[PDB]
Every structure is written in structure tokens, then in C-alpha cells.
């Protein structure tokens, strides 16, 4: 039972190494990146219209740092007047 | 009281006995 408790503590930590099959990247997997020779650039410029706002709120919640404040302005050079 | 409630048989070592009380049928090839 001591080894059973040790197994419960460790669980399946070192068995996640094989589960890295999703890390592999292949060009042919994406359906629309290949339909034209320049479809890669078309898809790369298709998401520039989208931003963080267009993301789903639950996926926005997944972006956790490992809100703007009114008194931090962005610098200018010509000003106004 | 959650600290004392969580202390039970599986933490004490009766985990194998607890799993033995759980019966389920699988579609094993072997």
C-alpha cells in the first residue's frame, strides 16, 4: 500500500511525454493554406481583420498572464493646438 | 473541517480495497 500511495502521488506525470504528438507541425494538415500557392499569405492576412475582441470570451479567459488605465497615455510627436 | 474530512481510507492506504468495491465490466480484447 505504500507503493500504491506513491503511485497515487505520482499519478501519470512521466507518461505525458508520449502525449506530445500534438506538438508536431505539418503544412498539409490545414485545409485552406494550400488551395492556392499564395493561400498561406491570404490566410495570414485574413486574421489581421480579427483581433482579441473577435476572440470568444472563454478563449479570452484562457489568456492568463504568467486592463488599461486612464493615466498612461501613448506618446506623440506633433501634439495639437 | 475540510482538512480532516479529506483524510480517509484511500489516504490511509485502503485505496486498493476501495477500488475493489467498485465493479465495472470492460470490453477487453485479452
Amino acid at each position: 500500500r505504500l507503493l500504491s500511495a506513491l503511485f497515487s502521488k505520482d499519478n501519470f506525470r512521466y507518461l505525458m511525454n508520449e502525449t506530445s504528438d500534438g506538438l508536431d507541425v505539418n503544412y498539409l494538415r490545414i485545409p485552406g493554406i494550400i488551395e492556392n500557392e499564395k493561400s498561406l499569405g491570404k490566410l495570414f492576412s485574413s486574421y489581421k481583420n480579427l483581433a482579441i475582441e473577435n476572440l470568444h470570451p472563454d478563449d479570452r479567459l484562457l489568456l492568463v498572464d504568467p486592463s488599461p488605465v486612464f493615466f498612461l497615455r501613448r506618446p506623440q510627436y506633433v501634439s495639437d493646438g | 473541517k475540510l482538512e480532516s474530512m479529506v483524510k480517509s481510507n484511500y489516504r490511509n492506504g485502503g485505496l486498493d480495497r476501495i477500488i475493489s468495491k467498485i465493479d465495472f465490466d470492460f470490453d477487453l480484447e485479452l
Binding site: 507503493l3 505525458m16 502525449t19 500534438g22 507541425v25 485545409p31 504568467p66 | 470490453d27
Partner: protein, 502 residues
């Protein structure tokens, strides 16, 4: 709120990226002129007839490579290779520039990579074929960034991480919008155990493209697992399943493992533990109805069947996993560990110790195998060998939080006697780890600490004995009460000593 699915990011994108990108019908103009032919890929498309028709009509190479991509989606790797080879034999590519031939060579490189991924065998041969195709593509057209991406992936497979990182640095200098470069860089950093940097790269890839294959959310869940925020990992994995409900059983496997971890470490009562464990078993069985030969699922089920005293079926599954997945050393180590655990009931101490040694040699990260090896050394009455092995393991792994190892070291040092200070240190560390893990502290450690402190500090020994008595409650024995009475007698606490003696 808005539903989180593939249709959400479809509706976010324009209809050009909705309908055109997922067309299963290919339009092929004929050599006679304005005549075209539409072939639906839902039906059983023959590779040879389609290639002959495309060669006869001399269609644009985009149609050939699109048909190759669809046959890749169909799994027809040999058919896609035939398409690429006959495309190289077609008149259009021969009369085109070297850029088209380089693109088709890179497609053949990706075909070799996909065959290697789908088979996990013949790595050297497919790697050499892919390297030759990529070298031909680079010689014909060195200006294509896809050749650099392929070079980086080739270096990553051959564990040439530095050169691949240099290639991805060059690609980032060229443009920062390359999603594949970010994914490859994050894969390399994860391989180099740089989890946080890969986590920022995964977040950047997710923000740039939520519909990119491979799924970044798998890596985000892995990083959350490394940062203990497994709840967000499970949430992201559920979102991934919503986006990718097909051919993504690995996400279900990770969800099942996370559920098992939550059941092990969070169940507040026996009934809740039983309910969660049965729910995890039912979910695992439901995942098994799609794939019944996945070795990791058999390895996970082996633990449950070992707990069910079904050692024979555990042996059968372990031998099957060893026969199939002998390439993966982790499965060999796990199977050897389970065989040693089975033989422990049979008390085959030599055989179990040998199996533990083989498990250690297969995968050094299996701490449980080494602890079982030490237990088998204790079983064969090899006290000195077990002590030397435990000291070696502790000095090599001073940062490891193996509480039971430190408890065993404290007990062994108390038996030795001369190493009492090391016993005090290890038992205090065991107590601290158990308190941080909210696990029931064994009173035997307190008894050993009191015995050691008898010659050093009677106050600390009495305090530890009182803590042990409070932990035991009604399980107090005659020896504990007698030692408490003697402690109070030496403390001149006549009343308390008399009560303890009574």
C-alpha cells in the same frame, strides 16, 4: 453567450474563408477549352484515373496539389505520393519554373513526414527520403520560406535544436506573422523544457489563429499542467474538443488523466471518490469504444485491474504493450513496473528487483520503479545495499519531493543509530511535505523522532509523542502511554504522570 464551436470562428471569418477552404469538389478545366469537370471527393476517387485525366488536360498544378492534400486527408499517403510523382511527370510542371517543382518536392517531404508520423517506424529511411526531397527543393528554389520551415522541422526531428532555432530566428526576421514558425519554436522550447516561453508562443499562436492545425490549446493545457493550473487545462481541452470533435482522441486521454488526478487529490469522502472514479472509468471506456488498441489506455487500465487483483490480465496487457510499443521506453518501464508489482504478491523478490532495474534503465524518470527497487532490496534483507542506493538517489535528486523515501531513510538511519541527525532532517522534511499535501502524517515517524530525541531533547520527544497520541486518538497503545508517563515523571509532572499511568 455566444456558443464556442468551429462555427463561431467560421462566422467571425468572411465567407471566402468559410465555404471555399472546405470544398470537397474540385473544378478541373479541360484541354479542349472552356469545358470543365467537377469531381466530388466524397465519392471513391481513383488515384490513377484522376492523374491520367489531369495529365491529359494539363491542368494547373494547384489542382494536383489540392487533390494531393485531399488524399492526405483521406489517409491515402501512397496515392498522394503517386499524385506528386505523376505531377512531376506532367507537362505543366516541366514547362513551369523551378518554384513549382520545389513546392512539389516540399510536398513530398511533408508526405514522408506524415508517413513517419502515421507509422512511427522506418524513421531513418523516410528521413533520408524527406532530406533528399527538401535538398532538391532548396536547390531548385532557395527563396521559399517553406524550405526553411522544412529544414527547421528536419533539424528538430534529428534533435539539431540549435540549427532549427537559428532557422526560426531567420524566419522571424523575415516576418513575425509566420504561425508555423511560432509553433515549431514552441515545440523546440517545450522539448528543451522551456515551458513558459513555449506558453507565450502558444498564446500568440492562439491569438493569431484560433483555427490553426496543430491545436495550440493542447500545448496550453500541457503548460497549465506544468504550472498546476489543471482546471484551465481541462477547460481549454474541452474547448479544443468543441473546435476539433474528430481525430482528437489524445485530448480525451488528457481529460481522463486530469479527471483521475482530480479524483485522487480532491475527493473529500469515500463516496465522492467512488463516484468520481467510476465516472472516470466510464469516460475511459467510452473513449475505448473508438480505439481499443491504444497502449496508453491499456497501461492506465492496468492500474485499475491491478487494484482489482486481476494480475493475469495485467500481465497480458503489459506483454502486448511491450510487443507493440517496444520503441517507447516509457511504456517498457511502466510494463516492467507493473510486472514487478504483480510478482511482489508472488514474492518473487529477485524477479521483481530485476524488473525494477529494467524499468529504471528504460526510463530514469520513473521514481516509483526506483523506490520499488529499494523495497525489493529491503525484501532480500540487503540493508546496506538499499541504504547505499537510497543515499545515491537522494544525492542525485535532492530537489525531489519523495516523502516516503525520506521516511524510509529516517527509519533506516534510526536503525543504524549513528546517523540520527540525518533521520531528524528527513523526518522533518516528510512531516512538512505531508502537511503541505494535506495527507495523514504517520504516527510511526513521530515515535521514531521521539526515540531519537530521547538522547537529545526530552521536551521535543514528549511533544512529538503527544502529537502522535492526538493523531491516534483511540488507537493509543500501552507503550505510548507508559512513555508519556515516564516523560512526565522526569518532568516532575506527578499528576499528569499518574493520569498517564492510570
Amino acid at each position: 453567450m455566444s456558443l464556442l464551436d468551429q462555427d463561431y470562428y467560421l462566422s467571425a471569418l468572411p465567407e471566402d474563408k468559410r465555404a471555399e477552404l472546405v470544398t470537397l469538389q474540385l473544378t478541373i478545366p479541360l484541354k479542349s477549352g472552356d469545358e470543365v469537370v467537377t469531381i466530388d471527393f466524397n465519392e471513391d476517387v481513383d488515384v490513377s484515373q484522376l492523374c491520367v485525366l489531369l495529365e491529359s488536360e494539363n491542368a494547373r498544378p494547384d489542382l494536383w496539389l489540392s487533390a494531393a492534400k485531399v488524399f492526405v486527408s483521406k489517409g491515402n499517403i501512397a496515392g498522394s505520393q503517386e499524385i506528386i510523382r505523376k505531377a512531376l511527370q506532367s507537362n505543366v510542371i516541366l514547362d513551369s519554373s523551378a518554384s513549382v517543382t520545389s513546392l512539389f518536392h516540399n510536398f513530398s517531404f511533408w508526405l514522408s513526414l506524415m508517413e513517419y508520423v502515421s507509422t512511427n517506424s522506418r524513421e531513418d529511411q523516410f528521413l533520408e527520403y524527406a532530406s533528399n526531397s527538401l535538398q532538391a527543393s532548396n536547390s531548385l528554389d532557395s527563396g521559399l520560406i517553406l524550405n526553411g520551415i522544412g529544414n527547421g522541422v528536419l533539424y528538430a526531428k534529428s534533435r539539431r535544436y540549435d540549427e532549427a532555432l537559428k532557422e526560426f530566428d531567420n524566419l522571424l526576421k523575415k516576418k513575425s506573422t509566420n504561425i508555423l514558425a511560432i509553433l515549431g519554436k514552441a515545440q523546440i522550447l517545450y522539448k528543451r523544457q522551456k515551458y513558459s516561453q513555449a506558453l507565450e508562443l502558444y498564446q500568440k499562436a492562439l491569438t493569431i489563429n484560433p483555427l490553426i492545425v496543430p491545436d495550440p490549446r493542447l500545448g496550453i493545457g500541457l503548460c497549465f499542467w506544468h504550472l498546476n493550473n489543471k482546471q484551465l487545462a481541462e477547460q481549454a481541452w474541452h474547448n479544443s474538443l468543441k473546435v476539433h470533435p474528430q481525430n482528437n482522441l489524445n485530448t480525451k486521454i488528457l481529460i481522463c488523466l486530469a479527471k483521475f488526478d482530480y479524483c485522487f487529490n480532491e475527493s473529500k469522502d469515500d463516496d465522492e471518490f467512488t463516484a468520481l472514479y467510476r465516472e472516470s472509468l466510464e469516460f475511459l471506456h467510452s473513449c475505448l469504444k473508438e480505439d481499443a488498441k491504444h497502449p496508453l489506455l491499456l497501461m492506465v487500465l492496468a492500474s485499475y485491474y491491478f487494484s482489482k487483483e486481476d494480475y493475469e490480465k495485467v500481465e497480458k496487457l503489459c506483454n502486448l504493450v511491450l510487443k507493440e510499443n517496444s520503441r517507447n521506453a516509457a511504456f517498457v518501464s511502466a510494463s516492467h513496473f507493473w510486472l514487478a508489482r504483480v510478482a511482489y504478491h508472488k514474492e518473487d523478490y529477485v524477479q521483481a528487483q530485476k524488473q525494477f532495474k529494467q524499468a529504471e534503465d528504460s526510463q530514469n524518470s520513473n521514481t516509483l520503479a526506483k523506490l520499488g527497487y529499494a523495497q525489493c532490496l529491503i525484501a532480500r534483507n540487503e540493508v546496506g545495499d538499499a541504504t547505499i542506493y537510497l543515499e545515491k538517489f537522494f544525492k542525485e535528486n535532492q530537489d525531489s519531493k519523495s516523502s516516503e523515501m525520506m521516511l524510509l531513510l529516517g527509519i533506516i538511519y534510526s536503525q543504524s543509530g549513528k546517523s540520527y541527525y540525518k533521520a531528524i532532517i528527513f523526518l522533518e522534511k516528510y512531516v512538512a511535505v505531508c502537511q503541505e499535501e494535506n495527507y495523514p502524517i504517520l504516527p510511526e515517524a513521530y515515535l521514531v523522532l521521539s526515540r531519537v530525541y530521547e538522547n537529545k531533547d526530552l521536551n521535543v520527544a514528549l511533544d512529538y509523542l503527544m502529537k502522535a497520541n492526538d493523531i491516534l486518538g483511540d488507537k493509543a497503545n500501552v507503550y505510548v502511554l507508559n512513555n508519556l508517563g515516564i516523560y512526565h515523571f522526569f518532568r516532575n509532572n506527578v499528576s499528569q504522570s499518574s493520569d498517564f499511568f492510570a
